[PDB]
Amino acid sequence: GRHQPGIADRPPAQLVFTAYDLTTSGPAAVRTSLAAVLRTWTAAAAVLMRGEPLDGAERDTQGLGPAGLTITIGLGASALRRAGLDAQIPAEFADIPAMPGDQLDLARSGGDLGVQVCAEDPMVAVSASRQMRRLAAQDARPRWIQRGFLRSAAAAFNPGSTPRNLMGQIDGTDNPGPGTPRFDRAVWVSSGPEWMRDGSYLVCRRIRMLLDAWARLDETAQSAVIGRRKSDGTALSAPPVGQGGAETIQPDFTARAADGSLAIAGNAHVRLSHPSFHGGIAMLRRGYSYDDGLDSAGEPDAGLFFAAYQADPRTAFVAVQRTLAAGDALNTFIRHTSSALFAVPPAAPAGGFLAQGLFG
Numbered sequence: 030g031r032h033q034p035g036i037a038d039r040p041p042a043q044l045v046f047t048a049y050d051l052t053t054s055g056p057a058a059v060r061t062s063l064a065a066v067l068r069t070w071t072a073a074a075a076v077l078m079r080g081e082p083l084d085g086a087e088r089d090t091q092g093l094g095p096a097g098l099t100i101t102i103g104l105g106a107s108a109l110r111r112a113g114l115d116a117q118i119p120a121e122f123a124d125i126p127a128m129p130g131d132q133l134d135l136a137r138s139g140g141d142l143g144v145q146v147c148a149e150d151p152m153v154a155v156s157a158s159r160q161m162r163r164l165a166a167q168d169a170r171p172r173w174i175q176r177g178f179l180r181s182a183a184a185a186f187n188p189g190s191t192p193r194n195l196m197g198q199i200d201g202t203d204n205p206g207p208g209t210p211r212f213d214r215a216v217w218v219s220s221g222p223e224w225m226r227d228g229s230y231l232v233c234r235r236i237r238m239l240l241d242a243w244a245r246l247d248e249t250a251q252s253a254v255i256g257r258r259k260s261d262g263t264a265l266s267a268p269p270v271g272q273g274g275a276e277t278i279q280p281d282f283t284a285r286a287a288d289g290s291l292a293i294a295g296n297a298h299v300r301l302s303h304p305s306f307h308g309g310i311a312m313l314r315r316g317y318s319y320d321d322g323l324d325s326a327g328e329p330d331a332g333l334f335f336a337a338y339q340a341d342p343r344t345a346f347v348a349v350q351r352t353l354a355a356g357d358a359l360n361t362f363i364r365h366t367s368s369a370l371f372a373v374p375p376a377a378p379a380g381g382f383l384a385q386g387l388f389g
């Protein structure tokens with residue numbers, strides 16, 4: 030209704046995220062190109078998500094069903110800057126500041142436009158992502174492309190179980206649940222410039238995991254990095270499942286363990302990211318595992334393509350990452366190799382297009 034799909038939907042097994050740069054120059058020309066791409070993409074994304082044949086498409090999905098395809102479109106602040114639309118950049122749309130430990134690859138970062146393609150089927154996701162690319166080709170070219178994955182519905186004991194990441198951790202437990210007032214408050218913009226109300230702000234970070242170093246820790250040490258048991262996801266301040274535990278039991282940051290130590294370490298990931306240290310502000314983490322084989326030096330390159338939605342990145346992603354960068358035990362085992370912020374606007378009205386209000 031009011032929102033773009035692909036945010037509150039349960040994330041399916043496959044992701045293809047493409048950031049694009051507008052290829053013309055000059056504010057008037059960039060403005061025209063930006064509207065043209067948004068116009069074409071809004072219409073095409075609807076055809077594709079309905080499972081209808083797109084004019085000019087390739088037969089790479091012939092013989093397939095729609096497979097939960099969602100297509101979510103965001104604008105980079107550079108698109109508005111390049112188009113001379115600076116006055117319509119809301120306060121929340123501020124640039125993500127450089128932070129200690131950053132190792133951002135410029136070629137994999139930023140972008141005028143971002144397209145999140147999700148589907149349960151890998152061909153469906155790659156195919157739709159290439160169709161969006163084809164349709165924008167005269168006005169925009171990919172700047173970077175990330176493919177990601179999560180466990181499949183078919184193989185899961187239950188398709189609704191929280192995914193594990195490549196570190197073996199349950200990843201998503203304290204996300205707000207879709208359809209709840211907590212989710213709406215955390216995720217959707219509800220004030221400010223009209224064009225972004227019922228939108229959300231997306232922060233992408235391609236976070237490499239140092240998995241060989243990770244594997245040298247025993248599970249006790251790995252659990253202590255996060256603040257939750259790796260086995261069952263319970264807070265280390267709470268009992269494990271079977272001794273009264275449940276993953277909904279919130280962490281208690283002053284509880285003592287049986288050996289008298291602070292149960293959740295002062296540098297535990299969950300301690301430093303918890304809303305109670307950040308004014309109650311939560312975020313929707315909708316990330317995907319990635320595995321890009323070997324980097325240029327022959328070293329493994331796999332991790333988490335982090336993708337968080339929030340009403341205000343300043344008080345969500347940025348405020349939390351500032352704390353993590355200063356002290357998180359997890360920092361030993363991860364490297365942020367990219368960053369991109371996108372304003373993901375509300376759903377277009379019938380016959381309109383995404384972010385059309387910028388062009389009034």
Ligand code: HEM
Nearest residue numbers: 198199200201202203236255302303304333346349350363
């Ligand atoms: C590869 C990098 C990362 C890994 C492996 C990781 C892993 C985890 C795990 C295992 C949990 C506990 C279960 C859960 O509630 O989902 C968690 C919670 C959380 N993480 Fe991360 N995370 C990473 C990066 C980040 C970043 C970059 C941010 C924000 C800047 C972040 C923010 C959060 C938040 C807000 C929570 C929930 C806190 C709560 O309410 O309990 N994480 N993460």
